[PDB]
Design a binder for this molecule. Structure first.
Ligand SMILES: Cc1cc2nc3c(=O)[nH]c(=O)nc-3n(C[C@H](O)[C@H](O)[C@H](O)COP(=O)(O)OP(=O)(O)OC[C@H]3O[C@@H](n4cnc5c(N)ncnc54)[C@H](O)[C@@H]3O)c2cc1C
Ligand SMILES: CCCCCCCCCCCCCCCCCC(=O)O
Ligand SMILES: CCCCCCCCCCCCCCCCCC(=O)O
Length: 567
């Protein structure tokens, strides 16, 4: 009905991080008719605008509320995997940390035309930075906003940095500068604009909603890509979707001649929807009676996510009130007047923080690149699951209680060796995906070793002069968790997502039969179908995965508009 009688040059399946970038670049010249279909609503919540309100976005109506299959290797638990459900997708719900990883991460892909030297200019193109001017590693003038965080904890941030230095870590003045080594401690830059969230809805899509050639539908849940098998195999015709959930009528948006469907549903829902479209491992599609259009073993394989555990310690009584928890809430859980005034008057203070924006990259055992990311938070976890503790922190408002003052160090396996999968547990495209993160399944136990050594490193840092001045014992993992076996059990029971998720429709070279797209991001064996999102990442870079997704979308837009070639 909203697409009755229209023809589109591009249909974007999803309106998330990548989709917002493509919607902007593909609609620019006026010539091309662009449709965006997002299952979630418009992006208007104040909980999206205010970085500290990330606490409220977890397990909210603006999240998919995905749980994994039971993981036997993780004390038989289902793992929550946060995913944004609105225009801007996970860019609208994420911790805003700005990471590209290292040059070596893109070289390790081994994909023609996607080396570190190929991708650098596409990172720089996206960027405006408040703290770095033009140079080899930074642009000015791009639609993204990046800045140094506009909250600083006076006592605890400086203490973390001195502590890191005491255990022999060097400062890294720019984690995105590929002319020096990735390892070191410092401040993560953030995708914020004077302390408001600078998500890809705000930066890319919202400014161009006026364009007559761009049509964006919210509440539009795609159910499959329409693919025809006629005189020379499989051709995308468009997309089936409902505007009224499962019971709603199945509408179809149609491509114009020469049009393309671009999958932007992200590393969870893209492979799910491809499988619902007959693109996937033929045995999985047969099991739910889906006709196989393109038998691709790689669809939903190679799921890479960066698993996390944490240590937490209270401060001494005489340091009560110095934590970010004290800067956001008073002792009866009301939002501090000062935090509201600083946010509104100057885009400063606790409300501009997602909490996790200082830390380090560490080599636990002589690896080529750091295996460990540390995220230092100047507040104390009340749960060994940091995502559960963020949810508790949002629920804590107005409860009449005092959050105890202290610190957390989150330990992430940032270059994990384990992989998971996403598939179907049903033929109904409205049912949740069969999600398995596959944490700690790698053959050598490398990921478990990374996190075990992370906990040792966090204990060494907390034992430092700099931090032991402030701290009063340890809450997590606590005195019961000392031996390697005790630490391994604690990690199995508490391991959570640091919210990356890549690689489920991986890009590959010619001859790579585990790949789903070529180096032009085209789905093997289907005409008029591309993937442009986190799904195409061959091998997860170190650090948070949002900026790499924006780099891929910018380059894909340039390829599709004829402004660039690849290979
Ligand atoms: C909680 C959290 C914290 C993170 N922290 C950081 C961080 O600090 N820094 C960082 O750089 N990265 C971070 N990440 C990762 C980063 O946000 C993502 O990797 C990135 O946003 C992915 O972009 P994408 O376009 O691949 O997918 P998304 O941005 O997730 O977009 C997918 C879109 O498709 C939509 N969709 C799904 N199914 C359908 C359907 N059937 N029909 C229509 N639409 C559909 C979804 O609703 C969504 O809007 C975080 C992620 C999360 C979730
Ligand atoms: C639980 C910790 C996060 C809570 C954050 C909520 C803060 C609410 C404070 C009241 C401020 C509301 C008005 C200012 C915000 C408007 C959003 C914006 O335009 O940037
Ligand atoms: C955003 C500001 C909230 C700060 C108050 C929280 C106080 C306790 C700190 C808990 C830290 C655990 C580390 C978890 C980071 C989880 C969210 C994420 O993946 O971005």
């Amino acid at each position: 009905s909203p697409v009755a009688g229209q023809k589109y040059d591009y249909i974007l399946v999803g309106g998330g991080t990548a989709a917002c970038v493509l919607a902007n670049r593909l609609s620019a010249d006026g010539s091309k008719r662009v449709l965006v279909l997002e299952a979630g609503p418009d992006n208007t919540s104040r909980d999206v605008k205010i970085p500290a309100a990330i606490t409220r976005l977890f397990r909210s109506p603006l999240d998919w509320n995905l749980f994994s299959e039971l993981q036997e290797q993780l004390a038989e638990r289902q793992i929550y995997m946060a995913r944004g459900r609105l225009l801007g997708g996970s860019s609208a719900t994420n911790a805003t940390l700005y990471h590209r990883g290292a040059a070596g991460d893109y070289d390790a892909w081994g994909v023609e035309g996607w080396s570190s030297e190929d991708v650098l200019s596409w990172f720089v193109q996206a960027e405006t930075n408040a703290d770095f001017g033009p140079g080899a590693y930074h642009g000015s003038g791009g639609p993204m906003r990046v800045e140094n965080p506009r909250y600083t904890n006076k006592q605890l941030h400086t203490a973390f940095f001195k502590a890191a230095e005491e255990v022999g870590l060097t400062p890294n003045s720019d984690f995105n500068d590929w002319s020096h080594d990735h390892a070191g401690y410092g401040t993560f830059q953030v995708m914020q604009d004077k302390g408001t969230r600078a998500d890809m809805y705000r930066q890319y899509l919202k400014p161009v909603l006026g364009r007559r050639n761009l049509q964006v539908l919210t509440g539009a849940a795609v159910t499959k890509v329409n693919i025809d098998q006629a005189a020379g195999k499989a051709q995308a015709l468009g997309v089936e979707f409902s505007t009224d959930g499962p019971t709603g009528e199945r509408l179809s948006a149609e491509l114009a001649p020469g049009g393309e469907v671009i999958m932007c549903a992200g590393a969870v829902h893209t492979p799910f929807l491809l499988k619902h479209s007959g693109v996937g491992p033929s045995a999985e599609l047969k099991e739910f009676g889906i006709p196989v259009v393109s038998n691709l073993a790689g669809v939903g394989q190679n799921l890479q996510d960066q698993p996390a555990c944490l240590t937490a310690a209270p401060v001494k009584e005489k340091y009560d009130g110095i934590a970010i928890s004290d800067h956001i809430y008073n002792e009866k859980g009301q939002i501090r007047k000062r935090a509201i005034a600083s946010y509104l008057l100057g885009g400063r203070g606790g409300l501009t923080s997602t909490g996790s924006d200082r830390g380090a990259f560490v080599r636990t055992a002589g690896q080529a690149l750091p295996d460990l990311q540390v995220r230092f938070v100047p507040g104390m976890a009340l749960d060994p699951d940091g995502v559960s503790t963020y949810v508790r922190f949002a629920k804590f408002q107005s409860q009449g209680l005092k959050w105890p003052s202290g610190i957390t160090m989150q330990l992430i396996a940032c270059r994990p060796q384990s992989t998971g999968s996403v598939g179907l547990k049903s033929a109904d495209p409205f049912a949740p995906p069969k999600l398995s993160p596959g944490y700690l399944t790698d053959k050598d136990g490398a990921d478990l070793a990374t996190l075990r050594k992370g906990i040792h490193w966090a204990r060494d840092v907390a034992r430092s002069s700099a931090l032991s001045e402030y701290l009063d014992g340890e809450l997590f993992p606590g005195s019961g968790v000392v031996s390697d076996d005790q630490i391994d059990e604690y990690i199995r029971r508490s391991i959570h997502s640091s919210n990356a998720i890549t690689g489920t429709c991986k890009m590959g070279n010619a001859g790579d039969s585990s790949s789903v797209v070529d180096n032009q991001l085209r789905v093997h064996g289907v005409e008029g179908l591309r993937v442009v999102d986190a799904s195409v990442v061959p091998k997860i870079p170190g650090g948070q995965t949002g900026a790499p997704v924006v780099m891929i979308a910018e380059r894909a837009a340039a390829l599709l508009t004829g402004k660039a070639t690849i290979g």
